[PDB]
Amino acid sequence: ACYIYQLPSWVLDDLCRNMDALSEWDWMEFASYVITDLTQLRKIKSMEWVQGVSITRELLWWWGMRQATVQQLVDLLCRLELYRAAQIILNWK
Amino acid sequence: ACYIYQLPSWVLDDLCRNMDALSEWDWMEFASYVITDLTQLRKIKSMEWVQGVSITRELLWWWGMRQATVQQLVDLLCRLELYRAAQIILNWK
Amino acid sequence: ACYIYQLPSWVLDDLCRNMDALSEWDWMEFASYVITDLTQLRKIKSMEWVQGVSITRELLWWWGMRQATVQQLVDLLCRLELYRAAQIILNWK
Amino acid sequence: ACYIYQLPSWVLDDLCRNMDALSEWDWMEFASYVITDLTQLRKIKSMEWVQGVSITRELLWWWGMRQATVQQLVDLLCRLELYRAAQIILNWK
Amino acid sequence: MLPLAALNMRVRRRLSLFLNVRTQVAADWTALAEEMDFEYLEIRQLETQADPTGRLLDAWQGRPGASVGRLLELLTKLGRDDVLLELGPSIEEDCQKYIAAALEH
Amino acid sequence: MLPLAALNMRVRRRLSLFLNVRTQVAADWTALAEEMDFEYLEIRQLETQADPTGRLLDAWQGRPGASVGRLLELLTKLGRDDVLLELGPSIEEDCQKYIAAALEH
Amino acid sequence: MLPLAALNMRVRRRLSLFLNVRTQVAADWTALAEEMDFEYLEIRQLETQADPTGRLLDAWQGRPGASVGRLLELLTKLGRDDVLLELGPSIEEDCQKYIAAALEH
Amino acid sequence: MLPLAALNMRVRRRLSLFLNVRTQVAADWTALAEEMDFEYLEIRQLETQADPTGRLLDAWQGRPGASVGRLLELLTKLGRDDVLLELGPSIEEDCQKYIAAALEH
Amino acid sequence: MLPLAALNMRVRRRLSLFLNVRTQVAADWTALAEEMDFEYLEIRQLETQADPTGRLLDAWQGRPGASVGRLLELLTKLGRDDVLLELGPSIEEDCQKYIAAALEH
Amino acid sequence: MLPLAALNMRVRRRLSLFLNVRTQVAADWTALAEEMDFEYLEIRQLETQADPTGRLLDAWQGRPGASVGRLLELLTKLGRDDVLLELGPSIEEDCQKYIAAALEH
Amino acid sequence: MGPITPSTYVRCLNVGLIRKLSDFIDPQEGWKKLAVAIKKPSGDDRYNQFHIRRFEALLQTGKSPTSELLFDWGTTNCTVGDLVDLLIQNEFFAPASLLLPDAVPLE
Amino acid sequence: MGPITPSTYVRCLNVGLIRKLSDFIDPQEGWKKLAVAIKKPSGDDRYNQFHIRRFEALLQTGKSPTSELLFDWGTTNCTVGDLVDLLIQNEFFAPASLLLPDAVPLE
Amino acid sequence: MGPITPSTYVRCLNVGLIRKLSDFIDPQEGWKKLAVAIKKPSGDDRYNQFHIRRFEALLQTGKSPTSELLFDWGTTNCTVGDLVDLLIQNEFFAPASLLLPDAVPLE
Amino acid sequence: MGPITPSTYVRCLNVGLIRKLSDFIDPQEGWKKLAVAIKKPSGDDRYNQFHIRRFEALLQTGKSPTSELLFDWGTTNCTVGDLVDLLIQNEFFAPASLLLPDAVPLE
Numbered sequence A, B, C, D: 001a002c003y004i005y006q007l008p009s010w011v012l013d014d015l016c017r018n019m020d021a022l023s024e025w026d027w028m029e030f031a032s033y034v035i036t037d038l039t040q041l042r043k044i045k046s047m048e049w050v051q052g053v054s055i056t057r058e059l060l061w062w063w064g065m066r067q068a069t070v071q072q073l074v075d076l077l078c079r080l081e082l083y084r085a086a087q088i089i090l091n092w093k
Numbered sequence E, F, G, H, I, J: 001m002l003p004l005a006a007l008n009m010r011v012r013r014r015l016s017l018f019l020n021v022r023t024q025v026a027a028d029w030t031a032l033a034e035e036m037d038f039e040y041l042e043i044r045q046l047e048t049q050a051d052p053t054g055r056l057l058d059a060w061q062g063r064p065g066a067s068v069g070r071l072l073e074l075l076t077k078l079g080r081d082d083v084l085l086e087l088g089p090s091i092e093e094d095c096q097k098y099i100a101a102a103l104e105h
Numbered sequence K, L, M, N: 001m002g003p004i005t006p007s008t009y010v011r012c013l014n015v016g017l018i019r020k021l022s023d024f025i026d027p028q029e030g031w032k033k034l035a036v037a038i039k040k041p042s043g044d045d046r047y048n049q050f051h052i053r054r055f056e057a058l059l060q061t062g063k064s065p066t067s068e069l070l071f072d073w074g075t076t077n078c079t080v081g082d083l084v085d086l087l088i089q090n091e092f093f094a095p096a097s098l099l100l101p102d103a104v105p106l107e
Helices: A009-015 A024-031 A038-049 A056-065 A071-075 B009-015 B025-033 B038-049 B057-063 B071-075 C009-013 C024-031 C038-048 C054-062 C070-077 D009-014 D024-031 D038-050 D055-064 D072-077 E008-019 E029-035 E040-044 E051-055 E067-078 E088-094 F010-019 F029-035 F040-044 F054-057 F069-077 F086-095 G009-019 G030-035 G042-047 G051-059 G068-078 G088-094 H010-019 H029-035 H038-044 H051-060 H069-077 H081-095 I010-019 I027-035 I040-044 I052-059 I068-077 I081-095 J009-019 J029-033 J042-046 J052-061 J066-078 J090-096 K015-025 K030-037 K049-059 K064-072 K080-088 K092-097 L017-027 L030-037 L048-060 L064-072 L079-089 L093-099 M015-025 M030-035 M049-056 M067-070 M081-088 M093-099 N014-024 N031-037 N050-057 N065-073 N079-086 N093-099
Strands: none
Touching: A009 A056, A009 M030, A009 M049, A024 A038, A024 A056, A024 C070, A038 A056, A071 M081, B009 K030, B009 K049, B025 B038, B025 B057, B038 B057, B057 K049, C009 C054, C009 D024, C009 D038, C024 C038, C024 C054, C038 C054, C070 K030, D009 D055, D009 N031, D009 N050, D024 D038, D024 D055, D038 D055, D038 K015, E008 E051, E008 E088, E008 L048, E029 E040, E029 E051, E029 E067, E029 M015, E040 H010, E040 M015, F010 F054, F010 F086, F010 I040, F029 F040, F029 F054, F029 F069, F040 G009, G009 G030, G009 G051, G009 G088, G030 G051, G030 N079, G042 J009, G068 J029, G088 M030, H010 H051, H010 H081, H029 H038, H029 H051, H029 H069, H029 N014, H038 I010, H038 N014, H069 H081, I010 I052, I010 I081, I027 I040, I027 I052, I027 I068, I027 L017, I040 L017, I068 I081, J009 J029, J009 J052, J009 J090, J029 J042, J029 J052, J029 J066, J042 J052, K015 K030, K015 K064, K015 K092, K015 L030, K015 L048, K030 K049, K030 K064, K030 K080, K049 K064, K049 M015, K080 K092, L017 L030, L017 L064, L017 L093, L030 L048, L030 L064, L030 L079, L048 L064, L048 M081, L079 L093, M015 M030, M015 M093, M030 M049, M030 M067, M049 M067, M049 N014, M081 M093, N014 N031, N014 N065, N031 N050, N031 N065, N031 N079, N050 N065, N079 N093
């Protein structure tokens, strides 16, 4: 590993099982916390209610596009109290 | 008939009229009773609030994928007191 | 005008502002009185709590599908004491 | 500028950020107000729930095909209280 | 009976715009192709040129089963009753133009 | 009337870049070739040289039907009204330069 | 059997009509050409002068194994029964234009 | 060792069937063509006539590396182990047939 | 100035590679062929044999404007500044080689 | 070195099998023809008489720089090593059927 | 052709009008109700649980599965009659009226 | 030729301009709307359910089926008039304006 | 060929049957779960985050990405065994039963 | 060539690599954001609302319209610089890093 977009697709799968279907609030304030803004998140949320497409897939790959590490995904999975997720992406290191 | 996925599409239609729109509880405890688990049913519930897609359709076909008979559908339509439904899938036998 | 489904989309808009957000009972017994049945309205009610979709839109269009006139909408907007609505669909005649 | 379809694609981009993801009501009453009709809008609506395709993109381009000006887009972004949009299409004049 | 060489252009064209069109329950050419015993790859590297139904007929002609009634009985067998009806006459015809003619000797 | 030999180059050229270009509802040369009673393989082994329409005329010349009005009546019958209009004049012409001439005896 | 020369005009033409419909999925003149032990570039050449079936039967007609016996049992291998059910008559007839006229004249 | 001329039709055809169909992650002819040191622009003007794996070969023979061997070690560096196993014998054969002949002197 | 005959193969080839690949908004050979005053009809019966850029040249040489210069001021009017930079030297060269020779008298 | 005449039958044919596989992407007899200083229309002519590599080496055999030395150092430039690792034996042998027989007879 | 009658062929229907009686059957899973109502002569379901799913997936492409089904069941000739008689019988009166204003009762 | 007018011939239209009024008719199945609007003199549909699926196929090849249809219905002369007269009458004002800015009203 | 067995080649599979066990793996992102289950000999993921994306995009074209992937992972010979053994082990018993009704237990 | 630098030509880019930074720009309409970011020297939009629609249509054919546009805006030489300087400036750091790991800051 190294970058978000270099996560093995199952690892990303298990991790888009969390954040995805995970409390319209518990997620929404992870997203708003991804250095994003009002208008942008309006797009990336719309995507939810279309033929099963991981809103966190899209949020994650789009943070990929912006050169996000994986240590930054880990970081903000604790500084947001969503350990439930990082539990999996430490089964990798 | 024989397998879930071998139900004629209207028979499954009239049966996804039941379980589908049928008491957030009287359904949810049928699903949880399909030998599934906490994480999985989180997905298959999300699907309800998307352009009319039978949550039982999806629960049924997914039981399909796992070699479910149709005598196991009838069985658990009685052992769950949802006769209202099995009364259609006995109009076939 | 002539048929339900031949209503200009704003007129149906102003009319889907009424019956839509309009007392879960003042609505429900206009629906029940659209010549419908227990099972059917189960579907057409579920639609309400999905991404803003006029449950009267779908009740109207669905009466459209069955060759409903427009004089039958006006009719049943008086014989149900919901003048509040037909007051717009007479601003057309 | 001069006609809708003569809008530079970013300016249309920024403006398909508004109307697009913008209240299933705040949009649909702009659509219905574009001189359209019940049946047409049913098409132009369907397109929303398919691989990210701006429902306003297609509504606007389709008003394009109809020789719509640009002063009629601005007009109807005031006469509909959607200033939030026209704010960008005055950053061009 | 006789080889496809019998039926030409006129019908090959019609025939084409029936089976060229990929369907979900019905038989598009690929269904046919299959029955005329064609391998996997063969079918796919045929799913390329426009008008593969024609490109199918012409690949399965310098071939064994290559009859016309053979294709005919196939179509019937794949439940494409629509084709042998807006086309049936037009074929026992292009079989005449070939039987009567090319037989002046 | 007279044989193709009458109409030469000038029109054979024009004539070509109408019917050499393959159409979906209209008649390409293939449709024409068909009409001038040509086998299947005959047509295909002609879909090779560029300018098949010429190579069609040339093959259906030392042949039976070989008229020019014959071809002409065909074109009108295949609903190619466009060709016999940007071309009609120029043919009743190449028919004259042959009728008047080659008739000085 | 006997030298290729036996074969009249007719068939060396139909023979061509059939074997040089190029089909990259079944068996064309090339797949034959290769069974007549021609090299690659030898075929890439034939692939030039159109009617290469003919030109193949020329560049072969005088060679080691080259007979009509071979051409036939070669079509038989390729399974181009297409042509065996079609030139079979004209050819056992064309053997007796060279046979029933080569013990007298 | 031996050049591409070594192997022909039959194999060049079977080779096409495998690398002509573009795929998502496995290597198709382009991935090869590139491995044969071709430019982004040359490659496009290949993706143009059918059989570009076959065209790709004709165009990489009158060049340097062009070995049959290079063609193979490439196919294997590209992990198309499917094409190897299935064409394996057919290639070794078409070489024991060039080297075979192209010797009496 | 000097006609198209001036520049050949090598350059007529490289010029193909660039204008033969059809593109979305930049100008491909069709956009050119049009700029050399060819008809919608003539252009299609071009898009037929490969190398239409090359055929386009052959076809616009025995015509009016056909300058090497025309071809160039055209290429720039059409903003294919890519083709120019890259073939620039190679054309000026092929000219100092025509004018060069075609002089002893 | 020595006049082209040196080269016997064999290679003047293999030389042709190789250089007139026309390939628009790599280096064929045209890209050679232009290295032997032939004008455009000059090649357009050769492009007729099939076997034009031969006919090229004829319309050249007697000219200014025309030698086997040249033809070799010319295929060396175009990098058609295809042919240099194949005719190289037969050619340094064909120089000594005109060398080792041109100081005696 | 022009005078649409209960004797003509489905697959013979103008591609303008199909994209039109598409908008009736298309929304509200209307065609699903149609699909299963289509039965072969034996009596058995024409399209089954599986085929249905196929059509569903043509929403991701943006194609009237009314059409893709309509064309598709056209490959058995089925009369425009068969269509209304199956439109009425399934309560799709507004489309069946567009076809032929004959057998279209009034609630 | 140059001065495009409602008397000139469709199939005589510059190949640059067609690939241009292509971009009007081409997206949103715009040409489908045109295709069925094209009617023989008899009145009957020109292209029918089957013809049209042929054109649809030409997207897998990347071909303006606005064009492939345009050329193809050019083989019955139809005036540039018949074009806009059928463009206007089908509400394709933007393209018909590019043809001839004559009969192109204003909403 | 005909007698499909745990020894034959995947890429050898009739194109009729593929379009059939397509219907199993195809819906509910079933193939995504199979995609990531396919692993090289090394152990490393065969297809990665990026590859997967590729396939996703073939829904816009209407292609069985079960097939597009199936063909594509066929270019490594992988026995029809490797497929069920990967079908069962991933709980796709219904399609695995279609292949070879051997190792397909009963809940 | 081999040593990609902000001086080399875009249209000179390995066909393997293109299909690779295609996977970055290709999804989430990434390339639309790039297409409108490409501007002539005048300042005016390079591709306009109509051009863009053309590209979009190449999804029904299955063509990287990242590429089809990459190639196509290659016909004005544009340095691999102009590409990153347009990739960075539009926030596509992941792809521009692949090109030249020079000017690729870190959040």
